[PDB]
């Protein structure tokens, strides 16, 4: 600690070494939007095409929830059963649990119910997926002259692009807007009734006709002696064209005229599915929704993907151009750019304050050079803890400037003043100051770290931000302190010009130095005030109590939050058509939206991506989605040109004047936020009740959740309402006479109105699927039931209308289950400033009116937020108590920490006063800002107090006189640190740009808190020290040794 | 069958279990097609049951299978999602549709157990249906709805008929 | 020597009778297709024999936990498992942590 | 597999099935007149063998009353084989194979001797539908980084310096159609990340060394005076390496470093 | 384990029919409670006795 | 590996029929032993030579 | 169990079930005439039941 101050080149060696180790450790370091924050979840999915809700829930879903018995670290399970047949059983796990292993046990708990599953599922994919919820990027492919259509682009994508542009690492899961080409065979019921044939006959046909077949080899092992030929018999070979599929033999008519598939059915090389239409600005397109993986890099994935794609350009067909719509990537780059800019601005402004106080360049350089080595060095500490340069860390350094410049400035200041107090050379002055603030600086390190550590030990996303922050600034802090012991004093003893006793530069300089005079005089004025208030202390205690009360009040009536909403240059709109609506109408809506955006928002909107058939609440014709990109912020001024007001007027235009509900908005900051001051209600069936039983329970509950003026009214579920289900009872009796086979009756019903996965062919080299289905018109309105005939055992055709009792009913298409039993979800919240737990109490008390078999539950965010909460203030209480004790450690008093901590309110009331003035919220950033503020305020108070104590104890000076003198000597430094800090964090507070809401959210609180902290404590700390000290032994009061 | 594999002490249970099971999902078609649907379980497991919770009815009004039913219907499906559990053994058993054939009455009507098998098989099942306005529909179409097909049974009645 | 060489896992499947181009473009490339985001990947090489038996090798960075590497990759292939013929899955398909050199041969 | 390297030819633009192969033939043929550089260079892959196609005609079979399932299954079970069930030999469960015999599945004419019992009871010959012919087909289809490609194995003449043989394999490639390229795998992949890592190691290490010496000492001159000694230890390692005839490998680089070590000690 | 299992069961408790009562035959739980309670007792005993000697 | 393999074989050794003998043609195992023997020997020699110089 | 063990007697060359079972009879009966070495040597498992071939 002291040994370093005489070996200066050793010090600079440590300096430059860790500064260049810094820079080196700054180059190849990961960069992302946020760190890997959100909890990991894994999902099982199985495809049973055609099958209904009650079918897939009770043939695939339940058998999965029955054979998912033995997973470790399991939190909760939530399973979907779409009317489309696709099951979605998502298990979300304990945070930090190894995702890969959880997914693996789960997947090997999935292959227990595999032969028990339908044979159409068994070959059409069962998937286990580690899964997030938000796409990193969506890469669209289009054709400008409109040469090809959606399905074509989808084909080229799935054939040459959806695996070559991805030879760039960092992608987790793609959802294709479109579908792969299949061999689409469309059956004519009239042309197939004609020849006395059934869909089944087509099945067996294309099955046994089209295949690759096990052959053998000439000279097969083991051959016999003398044999000198070995070669491989080629057998039957799979198909290739739409041509080769028509000319397959179904039957031969007696006269010789053949019956080919070409006859009974129309054949096109067509996609495997036509459920979702991906329309890009009218122009036909096909897209890739690339989900980001749990723990994947951001900017290198996108750089190498765009490089790979631009290098995959020499494989491009007619007019096939690439578009890059949904991109959350350049937002990150520009964000980091502006944060770095903030750093530079803060640094330079601090430099300017430093010069406009010390007025000589080579002294300004002393704390100046101190800054790169603490920052860069912290990066080296960051590069060693295995985290990443995101927003939070860089913001941590932005705040750290204050702390590091605090320690450095304090050192340099005390040195400069000591030279004005004794006259000794640089070295001796240095040792004096260091000897005065040694235990002090160690202590401040201890306490600052004692406010940052208990925020590192809390869980959740707030705790992740807290981790990034704490690590950043604490590391920076330890660095600044060890710099104070090693780097700052070595710098003081050397480059610093020497000053003899009592200069102070009063009136000595023409341009700059006049300030000193104005400054110096005021200091004495200031001191005359301090004594003045120590003269009569009482009134200031009352005023203190007042200030405290104001702090409490202002704190209570302050809006809580989690994170700020972010204009990311990219937002989206969601579309919903009512029960049992049609693809056509939703297409109308999407094109209408796409018109509005590229019409009345031309200067703002750059590209719309209308994806119909794909929502969030469910899959279906009812729902649609449209992505919206906006050009670079450089061309977007104003208030109405920003995401919020845009979605405001968008929802304005798309609610009051439309037939169905359609809402436009912006994605949250993370990728899956805590569900605000509200919740995600899981209503669960237990005693095995109906679907209309549960639906009716939801009706009663949601009706109760509309019967208060003190909570909400007409709240809503996020999920599809009951769709019309069309029951077709085959009467077994009326069928078993006519000699028709139920297997065939069913299979024909399916293959007509559902579809069939039968075989695989070889398109251009790539294996694709073979599909047989009805045709466009012969499977629409219900009367088409009849038009399909079953060929009986001999050769007589029976109509479906001979047994098909037809009717209407209701059934919800989105069938949810929670922990092995039927359940239904209800999104919801609480009145604007209601505590969520209170809403919990009201909803549970409204769910205390349910029939055995109907219960309540909490899921997702509001699950982890349910049994954990009211201990955070206890943890911060721990922060202040630990700070208390630690100060008592470096000091040695169960009383002086009282005197310094009493100053803490004076720092909070200013963050609050700043929060209300501009209008923010007690979120994460404001809480960190609060903490920091408490920290620095406590620092300044700590040092003033320290000098008062040291004078009192080691020079025999009395209380009052020494408080006055300590006040005198350590005022200027307080103002140096303070002013440099406020002027350093100012660039944050008032800025507009990528994520500037974050900047303002930290900035505001930090600044205001600091203002009140200094410009009240510098009048309050002495009274604290005085009245606190008057409770420890009578004799002595005013000591005297020599 | 009960195949117990013991490993070197301190070895990570999960990876060993899966890797073993991913050598088990190699000999799965090699297993009878009648076994493959009758349950294969790979379990990280102690050797002694930790705790046993029994349920009774003092009055008399029910037997093993009933209590066991409510158990296996509402309870013995969650105690394996309470992490730290390897395998629960129900002292009892879950409800099934138990059909017991009369052999003289099966000789009587010229039938075999096989015919009963095929019967209840092809009679009781869910079958791939479709939708009115099936995707992709044609222009002008303004109705989309879900075809219900044959629906599995429920009672002792629906099994008699 | 120490555990120097990169860790690789290999899939092998019996596809009887079929020729080279049949098994390569139905099994081989089709395995590596849902593998876009493999961690610690050095280089990748997969073969398709005329005996119908495929040899799909995924190689990783050295010192990467073999068990864990196998977990991420085998769980990047068992995304592309129905993509392989369901007609092969009857005579055993094996995923094995595997080198290329015999430790010892005892005759 | 081969000591030295595994010269890897990679497909990039998807340029053919034997076209790329012809480029490789051009490559190995261009590099075949140098025995004063390399030795025992060889191609890695089975070349295209003659393939024997036997098309069944569906019509001419569906007339005679034979079942396609049965005709195929019989062709297979005859000249291929069948795995049907398992038996229990001496206590251990083993597999059951049924196939043709040593004499009925050799030369192609044995195609005929197999008859399918039709739906009624008449045996139909293979010559009723089996059009037979010859083709070309490679039996080994291997791929590298997701596409078919084939490499070139090799070694070098006694006095085995690896870098000269690698560099030479690259040097006869100065008459090749770029769009057909080179890359590395196996040994000389690791020997690739060994060497061209010298500037990173020496730049970080030696400068860090400069400052590190500068630490306990107090002059921007003394680290100069010490680091100036390092070459004098190197020139002798080199002079020893060439005279006996070795190579700049790993062991020689570690040796170099150690030598630098002792020299730096003495100077220090 | 017993917390999550007994909680798991206790949520299935407000759905229990007529006279359907629970019994606990194989229980390794309260034995722990009394054991640790007595160990703490031992700790206290050591403290106070040591104090007495002191 | 070779020791436990030698165990694997030697426990299967009392079950060997007429003339059923084992051969070791491909062995990368004893080479390790003899290599390490010569390297360690070299180390020791360096030590002793240092002693002699001293 | 402190004193005690778990003897797994293994058939290797494949000689049968009554070969090994009779071997176990010989061993367990002969190792019952040593009280000065072992104790309570026993089979833990159901003995061969009569199986009814149809
Ligand atoms: C850089 C810009 C300058 C920064 C600091 C400038 C400080 C300017 C302080 C001027 C205000 C005077 O400060 C205020 O008035 C006098 C000071 O004597 C004090 O009040 C005192 O007045 C007289 C002094 O004998 C009486 O003793 C009285 O009982 C006592 O309360 C305090 O009430 C003090 O709060």
Coordinates of C-alpha atoms in Angstrom, one line a residue, chain A residues 219-648:
Chain A
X219 CA -21.6 -62.4 -56.1
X220 CA -23.3 -62.1 -52.8
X221 CA -21.2 -62.8 -49.7
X222 CA -20.3 -65.5 -49.3
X223 CA -19.8 -66.5 -52.9
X224 CA -18.5 -69.8 -54.1
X225 CA -14.9 -70.4 -55.3
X226 CA -13.7 -69.2 -58.6
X227 CA -16.2 -66.3 -58.6
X228 CA -14.8 -63.2 -60.2
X229 CA -17.7 -60.8 -60.3
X230 CA -19.1 -58.7 -57.5
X231 CA -21.7 -56.0 -58.2
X232 CA -24.9 -54.6 -56.8
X233 CA -28.4 -55.4 -58.0
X234 CA -30.6 -52.3 -58.4
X235 CA -34.3 -52.9 -57.7
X236 CA -37.4 -50.7 -57.7
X237 CA -36.7 -47.0 -57.5
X238 CA -38.6 -44.1 -56.0
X239 CA -40.2 -41.4 -58.2
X240 CA -39.2 -37.9 -59.3
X241 CA -41.9 -35.9 -61.0
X242 CA -45.6 -34.9 -61.1
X243 CA -45.4 -36.8 -64.4
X244 CA -44.2 -40.1 -62.8
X245 CA -47.2 -39.9 -60.4
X246 CA -50.0 -39.6 -62.8
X247 CA -48.8 -42.6 -64.8
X248 CA -49.1 -45.0 -61.8
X249 CA -51.5 -48.0 -62.3
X250 CA -54.6 -48.1 -60.1
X251 CA -56.4 -50.8 -62.2
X252 CA -56.7 -52.0 -65.7
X253 CA -60.1 -51.9 -67.4
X254 CA -61.3 -55.0 -69.2
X255 CA -61.0 -53.6 -72.8
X256 CA -57.3 -52.7 -72.2
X257 CA -57.7 -49.0 -71.5
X258 CA -55.6 -48.4 -68.4
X259 CA -56.7 -46.6 -65.2
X260 CA -53.9 -44.3 -64.1
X261 CA -53.7 -41.8 -61.2
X262 CA -53.6 -39.1 -63.8
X263 CA -57.3 -39.9 -64.4
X264 CA -59.0 -40.1 -61.0
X265 CA -57.0 -37.2 -59.5
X266 CA -55.3 -33.9 -60.4
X267 CA -51.6 -33.7 -59.6
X268 CA -49.5 -30.7 -58.7
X269 CA -46.0 -30.2 -57.2
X270 CA -47.4 -28.3 -54.3
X271 CA -46.5 -27.4 -50.7
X272 CA -47.0 -29.7 -47.8
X273 CA -49.4 -27.2 -46.1
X274 CA -51.5 -24.2 -47.1
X275 CA -52.5 -23.0 -43.7
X276 CA -50.4 -19.8 -43.4
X277 CA -50.1 -17.1 -46.0
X278 CA -46.8 -15.1 -45.8
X279 CA -47.5 -11.8 -47.7
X280 CA -44.8 -9.1 -47.9
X281 CA -46.3 -5.7 -49.0
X282 CA -48.6 -7.3 -51.5
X283 CA -45.6 -8.9 -53.1
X284 CA -45.6 -12.7 -52.6
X285 CA -42.9 -14.0 -50.2
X286 CA -41.9 -16.7 -47.8
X287 CA -40.1 -16.1 -44.5
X288 CA -38.0 -17.6 -41.8
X289 CA -38.7 -16.8 -38.1
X290 CA -35.4 -17.4 -36.5
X291 CA -35.7 -17.8 -32.7
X292 CA -32.6 -17.0 -30.7
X293 CA -31.2 -19.7 -28.5
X294 CA -31.0 -19.7 -24.8
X295 CA -27.5 -18.3 -24.4
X296 CA -26.6 -17.2 -28.0
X297 CA -24.5 -14.3 -29.3
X298 CA -26.1 -11.4 -31.1
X299 CA -23.9 -9.3 -33.4
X300 CA -21.7 -12.0 -34.8
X301 CA -24.6 -14.3 -35.5
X302 CA -26.1 -11.5 -37.6
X303 CA -22.7 -10.4 -39.1
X304 CA -21.8 -13.9 -40.2
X305 CA -25.3 -14.7 -41.3
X306 CA -25.5 -11.6 -43.5
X307 CA -22.0 -12.4 -44.8
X308 CA -23.0 -16.0 -45.5
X309 CA -26.2 -14.9 -47.2
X310 CA -24.5 -12.3 -49.3
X311 CA -22.1 -15.0 -50.2
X312 CA -25.0 -17.4 -51.0
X313 CA -26.1 -14.8 -53.5
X314 CA -24.4 -16.5 -56.5
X315 CA -27.0 -19.2 -56.2
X316 CA -30.0 -16.9 -56.9
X317 CA -32.9 -17.7 -59.4
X318 CA -35.1 -15.2 -61.2
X319 CA -35.7 -11.9 -59.4
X320 CA -35.2 -13.6 -56.0
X321 CA -34.0 -10.9 -53.8
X322 CA -33.4 -10.9 -50.0
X323 CA -35.0 -8.6 -47.5
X324 CA -34.0 -8.2 -43.8
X325 CA -37.2 -7.1 -42.0
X326 CA -37.4 -8.1 -38.3
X327 CA -33.9 -7.2 -37.1
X328 CA -33.2 -6.5 -33.5
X329 CA -29.5 -6.4 -34.3
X330 CA -28.5 -3.0 -35.6
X331 CA -30.5 -1.6 -32.6
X332 CA -28.0 -3.2 -30.3
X333 CA -25.0 -2.0 -32.2
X334 CA -26.3 1.6 -32.3
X335 CA -27.3 1.4 -28.6
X336 CA -23.8 0.3 -27.6
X337 CA -22.5 3.1 -29.8
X338 CA -24.5 5.7 -28.0
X339 CA -23.6 4.3 -24.6
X340 CA -19.9 4.5 -25.5
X341 CA -20.6 8.0 -26.7
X342 CA -22.1 8.7 -23.3
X343 CA -18.9 7.4 -21.7
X344 CA -16.7 9.7 -23.9
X345 CA -18.9 12.7 -23.1
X346 CA -18.9 12.0 -19.3
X347 CA -15.1 11.5 -19.4
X348 CA -14.5 14.7 -21.3
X349 CA -16.9 16.7 -19.2
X350 CA -15.2 15.4 -16.0
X351 CA -11.9 16.5 -17.6
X352 CA -13.3 20.0 -18.1
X353 CA -14.5 20.3 -14.5
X354 CA -11.1 19.0 -13.4
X355 CA -9.3 21.7 -15.4
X356 CA -11.8 24.4 -14.3
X357 CA -10.9 23.5 -10.7
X358 CA -7.1 22.7 -10.7
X359 CA -6.4 25.0 -13.6
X360 CA -3.1 23.3 -14.7
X361 CA -3.0 20.7 -17.5
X362 CA -0.5 18.3 -16.0
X363 CA -2.5 18.1 -12.8
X364 CA -5.7 17.5 -14.7
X365 CA -4.0 14.6 -16.5
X366 CA -3.4 12.9 -13.2
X367 CA -7.0 11.8 -12.5
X368 CA -7.4 11.8 -16.3
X369 CA -4.9 9.0 -17.0
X370 CA -6.5 7.3 -13.9
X371 CA -9.7 6.7 -15.8
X372 CA -8.7 4.6 -18.8
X373 CA -6.8 2.2 -16.6
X374 CA -9.8 1.7 -14.3
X375 CA -12.2 1.2 -17.2
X376 CA -10.1 -1.0 -19.4
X377 CA -8.9 -2.8 -16.3
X378 CA -12.5 -3.5 -15.3
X379 CA -13.0 -5.0 -18.8
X380 CA -10.1 -7.3 -18.0
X381 CA -11.9 -8.2 -14.8
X382 CA -15.1 -8.6 -16.8
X383 CA -13.3 -10.7 -19.5
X384 CA -12.2 -12.9 -16.5
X385 CA -15.6 -13.4 -14.9
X386 CA -17.1 -14.7 -18.2
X387 CA -19.9 -12.2 -18.7
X388 CA -20.6 -9.8 -21.6
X389 CA -20.4 -6.2 -22.7
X390 CA -24.1 -5.4 -22.9
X391 CA -26.1 -2.2 -22.0
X392 CA -26.1 -2.8 -18.2
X393 CA -22.3 -3.2 -17.8
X394 CA -21.4 -0.1 -20.0
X395 CA -24.1 1.8 -18.0
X396 CA -22.3 0.5 -14.9
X397 CA -19.1 2.1 -16.1
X398 CA -21.0 5.3 -16.9
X399 CA -21.9 5.4 -13.3
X400 CA -18.5 4.1 -12.2
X401 CA -16.8 7.2 -13.6
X402 CA -18.2 9.1 -10.6
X403 CA -16.8 6.5 -8.1
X404 CA -13.3 6.2 -9.7
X405 CA -13.0 9.9 -10.2
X406 CA -14.3 10.2 -6.6
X407 CA -11.4 8.2 -5.1
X408 CA -8.8 9.7 -7.5
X409 CA -9.9 13.3 -7.1
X410 CA -10.1 12.9 -3.3
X411 CA -6.4 11.7 -3.3
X412 CA -5.1 14.4 -5.6
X413 CA -7.1 17.0 -3.8
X414 CA -5.9 16.1 -0.3
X415 CA -2.4 16.1 -1.8
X416 CA -2.8 19.5 -3.4
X417 CA -4.2 21.0 -0.1
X418 CA -1.6 19.4 2.1
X419 CA 1.1 21.1 -0.1
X420 CA -0.8 24.2 0.8
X421 CA -0.8 23.2 4.5
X422 CA 2.8 22.2 5.1
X423 CA 5.0 22.8 2.1
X424 CA 6.7 19.4 2.0
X425 CA 7.7 17.9 -1.4
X426 CA 5.3 15.7 -3.5
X427 CA 6.3 12.4 -1.8
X428 CA 5.8 13.6 1.8
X429 CA 2.5 15.3 1.0
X430 CA 1.4 12.1 -0.7
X431 CA 2.3 9.9 2.3
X432 CA 0.5 12.4 4.5
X433 CA -2.7 12.2 2.5
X434 CA -2.5 8.4 2.0
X435 CA -1.8 8.0 5.7
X436 CA -4.9 10.1 6.4
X437 CA -7.3 8.2 4.0
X438 CA -5.8 4.7 4.0
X439 CA -8.2 3.0 6.3
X440 CA -10.8 5.5 5.0
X441 CA -10.4 4.4 1.3
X442 CA -10.3 0.7 2.3
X443 CA -13.5 1.3 4.3
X444 CA -15.3 3.1 1.5
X445 CA -14.4 0.2 -0.8
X446 CA -15.8 -2.1 1.9
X447 CA -19.1 -0.1 2.3
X448 CA -19.7 0.6 -1.4
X449 CA -19.1 -3.1 -2.0
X450 CA -21.4 -3.6 1.0
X451 CA -24.3 -1.9 -0.9
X452 CA -23.6 -3.7 -4.2
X453 CA -23.1 -7.2 -2.8
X454 CA -26.6 -7.6 -1.2
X455 CA -28.1 -6.7 -4.6
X456 CA -26.0 -9.4 -6.3
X457 CA -27.5 -12.1 -4.0
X458 CA -31.1 -11.5 -5.0
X459 CA -32.8 -13.7 -7.7
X460 CA -34.6 -12.9 -10.9
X461 CA -34.0 -10.6 -13.9
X462 CA -33.6 -7.6 -11.6
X463 CA -31.0 -9.7 -10.0
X464 CA -29.3 -10.3 -13.3
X465 CA -29.1 -6.6 -14.0
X466 CA -27.9 -6.2 -10.4
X467 CA -25.3 -8.8 -11.1
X468 CA -23.9 -7.1 -14.2
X469 CA -24.0 -3.7 -12.4
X470 CA -22.5 -4.9 -9.1
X471 CA -19.7 -6.8 -10.8
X472 CA -18.9 -3.9 -13.1
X473 CA -18.9 -1.1 -10.6
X474 CA -17.4 -3.1 -7.7
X475 CA -14.6 -4.4 -9.9
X476 CA -14.1 -0.8 -11.1
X477 CA -14.1 0.2 -7.4
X478 CA -11.5 -2.3 -6.1
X479 CA -9.5 -1.2 -9.1
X480 CA -9.9 2.5 -8.2
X481 CA -8.9 1.7 -4.6
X482 CA -5.9 -0.4 -5.4
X483 CA -5.2 2.4 -7.9
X484 CA -5.5 4.8 -4.9
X485 CA -2.8 2.7 -3.0
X486 CA -0.6 1.9 -6.1
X487 CA -1.4 4.2 -9.0
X488 CA -2.6 7.5 -7.7
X489 CA 0.2 8.1 -5.1
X490 CA 2.9 7.1 -7.6
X491 CA 1.3 9.7 -9.9
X492 CA 1.2 12.3 -7.1
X493 CA 4.9 11.9 -6.2
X494 CA 6.0 12.3 -9.8
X495 CA 4.3 14.2 -12.6
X496 CA 2.6 16.6 -10.1
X497 CA 4.3 20.0 -9.8
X498 CA 5.3 20.9 -6.2
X499 CA 3.5 23.6 -4.2
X500 CA 4.9 25.2 -1.0
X501 CA 2.9 26.2 2.1
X502 CA -0.3 28.1 1.7
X503 CA -0.5 29.2 -2.0
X504 CA -4.2 28.6 -2.8
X505 CA -3.9 30.8 -5.9
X506 CA -6.2 33.5 -4.6
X507 CA -6.4 36.4 -7.1
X508 CA -3.1 35.2 -8.5
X509 CA -4.3 34.5 -12.0
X510 CA -6.1 36.8 -14.6
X511 CA -8.4 34.6 -16.6
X512 CA -9.0 31.4 -14.6
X513 CA -7.7 32.1 -11.1
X514 CA -10.3 34.8 -10.3
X515 CA -12.6 31.9 -9.6
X516 CA -10.4 30.7 -6.7
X517 CA -10.9 34.0 -5.0
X518 CA -14.6 33.9 -5.5
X519 CA -14.4 30.2 -4.4
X520 CA -12.1 30.8 -1.4
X521 CA -14.1 33.7 0.1
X522 CA -17.3 31.6 -0.2
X523 CA -15.6 28.8 1.6
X524 CA -15.0 31.0 4.6
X525 CA -18.6 32.2 4.2
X526 CA -19.6 28.5 4.2
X527 CA -17.5 27.8 7.3
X528 CA -19.1 30.8 9.0
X529 CA -22.4 29.1 8.2
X530 CA -21.4 25.7 9.6
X531 CA -20.3 27.0 13.0
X532 CA -23.4 29.1 12.8
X533 CA -25.6 26.0 12.7
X534 CA -23.5 24.1 15.2
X535 CA -24.1 27.2 17.4
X536 CA -27.9 26.4 17.4
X537 CA -28.4 22.8 16.4
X538 CA -32.0 22.2 17.4
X539 CA -34.0 23.7 14.5
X540 CA -32.0 21.7 12.0
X541 CA -33.0 18.5 13.7
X542 CA -36.7 19.4 13.2
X543 CA -35.9 20.3 9.6
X544 CA -34.2 16.9 9.2
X545 CA -37.2 15.1 10.5
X546 CA -39.3 17.1 8.0
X547 CA -36.9 16.1 5.1
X548 CA -37.1 12.4 6.2
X549 CA -40.9 12.5 6.3
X550 CA -40.9 14.1 2.8
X551 CA -38.7 11.3 1.6
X552 CA -41.0 8.6 3.0
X553 CA -44.1 10.2 1.5
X554 CA -42.5 10.8 -1.9
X555 CA -41.3 7.2 -1.9
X556 CA -44.6 5.6 -1.1
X557 CA -46.7 7.5 -3.8
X558 CA -44.2 6.5 -6.5
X559 CA -45.1 4.1 -9.4
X560 CA -43.3 0.8 -9.3
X561 CA -42.1 -1.1 -12.4
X562 CA -39.7 -3.7 -13.8
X563 CA -38.0 -2.1 -16.9
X564 CA -38.8 0.6 -19.4
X565 CA -40.6 0.1 -22.7
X566 CA -38.3 0.4 -25.7
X567 CA -38.7 1.9 -29.1
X568 CA -36.5 -0.6 -30.9
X569 CA -37.1 0.7 -34.4
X570 CA -39.3 -2.3 -34.9
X571 CA -42.8 -3.3 -33.7
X572 CA -45.7 -5.5 -34.7
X573 CA -49.5 -5.7 -34.9
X574 CA -51.8 -8.6 -34.0
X575 CA -55.1 -9.5 -35.7
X576 CA -58.0 -11.5 -34.5
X577 CA -61.1 -12.7 -36.4
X578 CA -64.1 -13.9 -34.4
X579 CA -65.3 -17.5 -33.8
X580 CA -65.1 -19.8 -36.8
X581 CA -64.0 -17.0 -39.3
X582 CA -62.2 -17.6 -42.5
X583 CA -58.7 -17.1 -44.0
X584 CA -60.1 -14.8 -46.7
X585 CA -61.4 -12.2 -44.2
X586 CA -58.1 -12.3 -42.2
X587 CA -56.2 -11.7 -45.4
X588 CA -58.5 -8.7 -46.0
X589 CA -57.5 -7.4 -42.5
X590 CA -53.8 -8.0 -43.1
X591 CA -53.8 -6.2 -46.5
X592 CA -55.8 -3.4 -44.9
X593 CA -53.3 -3.0 -42.1
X594 CA -50.4 -3.2 -44.6
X595 CA -52.1 -0.5 -46.5
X596 CA -52.6 1.8 -43.5
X597 CA -48.9 1.5 -42.5
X598 CA -47.5 2.2 -46.0
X599 CA -50.0 4.9 -46.6
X600 CA -50.7 7.2 -43.7
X601 CA -47.4 6.5 -42.0
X602 CA -45.2 6.6 -45.1
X603 CA -42.5 8.8 -43.6
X604 CA -42.2 6.4 -40.7
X605 CA -43.0 2.9 -42.0
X606 CA -40.4 1.1 -44.1
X607 CA -41.8 -2.5 -44.5
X608 CA -44.7 -4.6 -43.3
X609 CA -44.7 -8.4 -43.0
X610 CA -48.3 -9.7 -43.1
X611 CA -48.3 -13.3 -41.8
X612 CA -51.8 -14.7 -41.8
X613 CA -52.7 -17.9 -39.9
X614 CA -50.1 -17.4 -37.3
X615 CA -50.8 -15.6 -34.0
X616 CA -49.7 -16.2 -30.4
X617 CA -53.0 -17.2 -28.6
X618 CA -53.4 -20.0 -31.2
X619 CA -53.0 -21.2 -34.7
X620 CA -55.8 -20.7 -37.2
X621 CA -57.6 -18.8 -39.9
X622 CA -59.0 -16.6 -37.2
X623 CA -55.7 -15.0 -36.3
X624 CA -53.2 -13.0 -38.3
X625 CA -49.9 -11.1 -37.6
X626 CA -48.1 -8.3 -39.3
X627 CA -44.5 -7.2 -38.6
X628 CA -43.6 -3.6 -39.0
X629 CA -40.1 -2.2 -39.7
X630 CA -39.3 1.5 -39.5
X631 CA -36.3 3.2 -41.2
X632 CA -33.2 4.5 -39.2
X633 CA -33.9 6.9 -36.3
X634 CA -31.9 9.5 -38.2
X635 CA -35.0 10.3 -40.2
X636 CA -37.5 10.0 -37.3
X637 CA -37.8 13.3 -35.2
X638 CA -40.9 14.4 -33.2
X639 CA -43.1 12.7 -30.7
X640 CA -45.7 11.3 -33.1
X641 CA -42.9 9.7 -35.2
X642 CA -42.0 7.3 -32.4
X643 CA -43.2 3.7 -31.7
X644 CA -45.5 4.6 -28.8
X645 CA -47.6 7.3 -30.4
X646 CA -47.6 5.3 -33.6
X647 CA -49.1 2.2 -32.0
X648 CA -51.4 4.7 -30.1

